[PDB]
Amino acid sequence: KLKITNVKTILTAPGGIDLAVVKVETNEPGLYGLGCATFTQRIFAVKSAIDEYMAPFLIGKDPTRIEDIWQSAAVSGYWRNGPIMNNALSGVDMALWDIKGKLAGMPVYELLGGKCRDGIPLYCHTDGGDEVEVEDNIRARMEEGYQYVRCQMGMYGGPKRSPRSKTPGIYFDPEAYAKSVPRLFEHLRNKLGFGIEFIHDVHERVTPVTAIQLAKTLEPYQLFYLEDPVAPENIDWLRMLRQQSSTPISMGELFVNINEWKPLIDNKLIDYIRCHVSTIGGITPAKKLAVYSELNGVRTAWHGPGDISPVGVCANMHLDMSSPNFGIQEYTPMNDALREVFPGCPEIDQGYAYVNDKPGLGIDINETLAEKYPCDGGIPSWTMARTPDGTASRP
Template sequence: MNKTKNNNRRGFLQKLGLGGLSLATMSMAPIEEQLEYSTQNVNRNSAPSDLKITDMRIAEVSGVMFRTPIVRIYTNQGIVGHGDVRDGAAKEYALFLKSRLLGENPCNVERLFKIISQFGHHGRQGGGVSGVEMALWDIVGKAYGVPVYQLLGGKYRDKVRVYCDTTTSSDPQEYANRMQERVDKGYTALKMDIGINLLRDIPGALINGPNGKFSPYEHEYRQYNLTKHPFTRVQITEKGLEKLCEFLEVMRNQIGYEIPMGTDHWGHFDVNEAIKIARAVEKYNLAYIEDIIPWQYTDQWKEITMSTTTPTQTGEDIYMLYGGFKELIDQRAVDIVHPDPNTAGGILETKRIGDYASHHGIGFMLHHAAGPVSFLGSVHAAAATENFMWLEHHAVDSPKWEDLVTGIDKPIVEDGYVAVPETPGIGVELNEEMVKEFLVEGEKLFAPTEEWNEIRAWDRLWS
């Protein structure tokens, strides 16, 4: 190739990069230029088709967030990927999957997900599969030199809006002041935990209250917090309802009505009490009322949703689209679905849930309460899903939380938003010294896990 032609080609490629032109624009260019353009960001130290998983280890941390096992997957080319098992879940949920992954190409994310997905379940039991799935996407992005959102089809937004919890107080004004502090920090969406726990010391507020003088659980093997809502027979009196509404009244007087505000953790009671509450709080224009009964009761959720103008929301404990979300969405049983990517099946499955909800006109938010790795993995899922609303940030009061990772501008959350990472993979690496500081007592940093190398079971689900 002569010098003039070489300079022209270089200038053309530079224009493509600066102008944001697509591969479609390259269709008339020579094949060598098309190839160079399409692979310009590929990690030249990586041969993605030859990648193999060689090891998987865990570092379990606590104290800077809820107890969370961090997954690290190793490859034969030195690329490693990270993901979080869901907060409060057992590391064994992920380690059990190791023998199914060794020797496999991590770039085949969907195929590997179908191999391991049978070993996940609802709640924390989805944490192993979800954490591994995120770590696989992290590897793929690093191998190809692109952020994960690009592997999902691109992004709908450059920044992801977050919402945050607020620590509770039995004093309504103090509670409202704490919420105002969140607003002063730049948060533009909030959530407050409000429920019968705030009524325990108020005589006449509850019937059959779990901490009442008749001690209804004294002779039960199962405690109140492990009893599903329909079976507690807790009822809220008019006095109790007025007290809960006082919290909302003071809150709205403090922060106003411009900011979306949702509620969670109301307590364990049946559909009748749920409807009573949802109707009573309509005048406060809540953004949503979350998990007011267990997610499994689709028909009861639909009854609540049809009985009130207060938006309903559930989903943080549901594993996979076809594990529960599909029925809720098909029945229009809730107004908003609320998966946690660390339970739902990881990044791609979370996007699938959001896309399915969008097709049916249902809102889509993300729950999250683990580490910064999966938080940013959730950001990629949010960026790539059209009908996304807000992502939960559960570490507002833990300043060292974001120090667990490097390679990203900080603060990670600024003025209530997270910039979508543009670096390869999820977009961060672990700060191992900081991870060491918060290791669970007795844990070692990514200690060997050879005992999980061999498959000792026949996994096929059919004969």
């Protein structure tokens, strides 16, 4: 008797970043579910994938068969395993989980095993043009109670002279950046000590052997993790990196394929998995990945940037709450508009997030207010990255 009746996409940008949220409606009045489908750079293609394909696929189906729906939806177009398609899956799969919590009168984290911890430790971003400005941010965050911070200085060497004419793009200098990082952590550790945990994100910006040298050279500074030392396309290089360095490694925010993460985890080539939950297809595959990670002694560090709706932020945190091998939660602070469009955002208190104990994902969306923040769209400029000679780089 219980059936899905409609599946819609809501495009909104209350925090200044384009989000896509899927609402799954049922034939029981007042019962619906929400999921995150935020691939911010391709939101109009996610909307199209949802509206043209997922909706007619799902109408009339029983929403509680979460796994049957996930498996059959994922193969419905034959070709599969990519970010746009995975996000259409995630919008729906999170919405079904959310519905299931509502039917059970339980938060999703109670369905997945119950609380494994009393609060969810967070890290946040601290930027700076130089060593002194970065420290200032770290200081401001420490006073708010963060015990973990990600430290970047500048924009990856944004130093060598270019040729006499340049093709447009955002120019960076990988070797300049690579030499400056150790100097940054020497300063920070000297200034602030070793109580505070540091994360640094290489963001696939240097060649693999440069990343290996960096990992080795940062060993004295004891990072919580070094993130993204290679692109997904270069993951075989981690065999060599892990023969030589003891700095903790994270990878995975870019992953969209089991053949990317499985070999890393099987071989202990990373210490934290960083997948963007919606980008791997939602709660159902993320839970599986978390378990695979757990048995291999690898911990989770779900991607938590600004380009994730509060619905996905709840999703991450429900997974965090119920995972024994939870590592840490990246967190990007929200504005008032986001909290008003999405009542139920988790409470943030002194470096910890406390999720509410409302049923499902414990999160709502106000469609009326959402319409007041239409999406910008447009090509981001920062993904056009060039090295000093003008070579287009993975950004």
